[PDB]
């Protein structure tokens, strides 16, 4: 809790100065649309249930952020592992990504603060 936090005297996440859950699912759908509209990056989720996908991104972003949410899914080298998945194309994703956030009035300081917090992640997502 937002409230129950700062009567712990501990510092605001990134999760609750956006808008905790509700911006994150908002923000996912988005992303998502602009993912599955770019032809460069479709192919990927060819076989895959984006429903499923949406609700595990939403719970991996959200714990990422500082929420008290469960991620519930795979780890991110093996599930990315094998996939061909290169920068170019962590990168393009990481853009759909900004202009969702953009898109959802998220300050770009802000914006730019979570992708210095998944950046890291593509030495796990990327093959090399
Ligand atoms: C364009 C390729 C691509 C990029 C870039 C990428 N992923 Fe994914 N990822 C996928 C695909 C495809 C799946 C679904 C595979 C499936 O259907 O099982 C997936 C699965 C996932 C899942 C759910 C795993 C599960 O347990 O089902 C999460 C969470 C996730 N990715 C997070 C991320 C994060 C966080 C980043 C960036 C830091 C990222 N992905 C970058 C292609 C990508
Ligand atoms: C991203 N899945
Ligand atoms: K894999
Ligand atoms: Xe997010
Ligand atoms: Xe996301
Ligand atoms: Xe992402
Ligand atoms: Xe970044």
Known sequence: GLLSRLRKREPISIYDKIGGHEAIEVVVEDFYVRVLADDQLSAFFSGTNMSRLKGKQV????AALGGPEPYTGAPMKQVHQGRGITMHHFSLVAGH??????????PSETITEILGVIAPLAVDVTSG
């Open 59 to 62: 719970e991996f972003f959200a």
């Open 97 to 106: 990504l900004a202009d969702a956030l953009t898109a959802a009035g998220v």
